[PDB]
Amino acid sequence: DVPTGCVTLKFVNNAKHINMWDKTVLHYRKLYGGDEKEEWVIEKSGNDYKIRPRIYTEYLYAESKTDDPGRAVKTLKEGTTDANVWKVEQKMALYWISNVKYQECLVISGSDHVVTKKMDSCGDDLWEIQPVSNCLIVGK
Question: Which cysteines does the record link by disulfide bonds (predicted)?
């Protein structure tokens, strides 16, 4: 079904991969839609999944309130969170991703924001999850 391990995360409609900032701000790392093939790790978490970049042990999560461009998604450097578990579901060769806590689809916006958005269905906002052989997950 969903590949676990090292993957690339590419939003189909935009051709944008999830990229991250080089330097952590406060307790979080900012993300944006970019064109570089950033490597991420999908880990099984119960019936659902957690997501982290290959080189940092920081878990993808969704913020607690919705902003103008949508509910911001970033990785958690310091602290704890309840919104770091992701549903990842196959639709033929493509996937849609949804935050479990808030039931909102992960998406890259037209302005390159990485956000979740409540939709009747995530099935029109699909991701390309291409596995990356030679997967070196950094610990700490």
Answer: 6-135, 105-122
